[PDB]
Design an enzyme around this catalytic site. Structure first.
Site, mmCIF file in Angstrom:
data_model
loop_
_atom_site.group_PDB
_atom_site.id
_atom_site.type_symbol
_atom_site.label_atom_id
_atom_site.label_comp_id
_atom_site.label_asym_id
_atom_site.label_seq_id
_atom_site.Cartn_x
_atom_site.Cartn_y
_atom_site.Cartn_z
ATOM 1 N N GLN A 20 0.786 -1.229 0.000
ATOM 2 C CA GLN A 20 0.000 0.000 0.000
ATOM 3 C C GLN A 20 0.826 1.292 0.000
ATOM 4 O O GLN A 20 0.278 2.379 -0.214
ATOM 5 C CB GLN A 20 -0.935 0.001 1.200
ATOM 6 C CG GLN A 20 -0.202 0.153 2.528
ATOM 7 C CD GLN A 20 -1.145 0.031 3.705
ATOM 8 O OE1 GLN A 20 -1.567 -1.067 4.055
ATOM 9 N NE2 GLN A 20 -1.493 1.167 4.313
ATOM 10 N N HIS A 162 -5.547 -1.869 11.744
ATOM 11 C CA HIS A 162 -5.113 -2.332 10.427
ATOM 12 C C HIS A 162 -6.071 -3.337 9.781
ATOM 13 O O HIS A 162 -6.507 -4.295 10.424
ATOM 14 C CB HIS A 162 -3.715 -2.953 10.607
ATOM 15 C CG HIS A 162 -2.997 -3.265 9.333
ATOM 16 N ND1 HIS A 162 -2.953 -2.388 8.268
ATOM 17 C CD2 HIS A 162 -2.235 -4.327 8.977
ATOM 18 C CE1 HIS A 162 -2.196 -2.900 7.313
ATOM 19 N NE2 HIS A 162 -1.746 -4.076 7.716
#
Length: 224
Positions: A20, A162
């Protein structure tokens, strides 16, 4: 009756490990793993999908690189009639303006989404036996962050921060139950990008709180 073990990567329902980058888009990556998975399970074709479309276009609540939630993203995909491919709307790890031309080229649709009963690893196991499942965990600690190999057993808290996805489960030869998790920090992290986390622990919340906020997409028809 759930099988002794399931590995969606081996079954062909998981794409390459992504990274990411410097964008807080874990929620988008977590969502996409689950959609890419159910799509292959239903259509027998593995298609890499667009995390960027979510970052740029799923803005009712989610905040692109500033965070979001998988449940809202599934809702977005359901309402847009689908999510387009990675090829058509590639990830550039930044907050882009929603490219309407690419957003309106959905490649994979879903009928909706549902949540796994909270703090119930047995319910979670049954869900994973069917397809990859999106989950939230506490990845803010050093033990989790520097994980490199083996079955991670701790130490981590349960303050969710997360979004990742469970792509399988099993039991090592030594008898240690585990969840196979796909992370979005590049193939360089953990076991080629994945982390095996101890399963069925003594805390109802699961390791790093993995059983607290699990959800998955629904897709009944076999077409797109």
């Amino acid at each position: 009756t759930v099988p002794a073990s399931v590995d969606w990567r081996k079954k062909g329902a998981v794409t390459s490990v992504k990274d990411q980058g410097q964008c807080g888009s874990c929620w988008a990556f977590s969502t996409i793993v689950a959609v890419e998975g159910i799509n292959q399970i239903k259509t027998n074709k593995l298609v890499s999908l667009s995390e960027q479309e979510l970052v740029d276009c799923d803005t009712d609540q989610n905040q692109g690189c500033n965070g979001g939630l998988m449940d809202y993203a599934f809702e977005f995909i359901k309402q847009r009639g689908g999510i387009t491919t990675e090829a058509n709307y590639p990830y550039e790890a930044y907050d882009g303006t929603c490219d309407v031309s690419k957003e309106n080229a959905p490649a994979v649709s879903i009928d909706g989404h549902e949540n796994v009963p909270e703090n119930d690893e047995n319910a979670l196991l049954k869900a994973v036996a069917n397809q990859p499942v999106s989950v939230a965990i506490d990845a803010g600690g050093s033990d989790f962050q520097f994980y490199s190999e083996g079955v991670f057993t701790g130490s981590c808290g349960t303050e969710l921060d997360h979004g990742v996805a469970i792509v399988g489960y099993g039991t090592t030869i030594d008898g240690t139950k585990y969840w196979t998790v796909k992370n979005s920090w590049g193939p360089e992290w953990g076991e080629k990008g994945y982390i095996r986390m101890e399963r069925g622990i003594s805390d109802k919340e699961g390791l790093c709180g993995i059983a607290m906020e699990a959800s998955y997409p629904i897709k009944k028809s076999s077409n797109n």
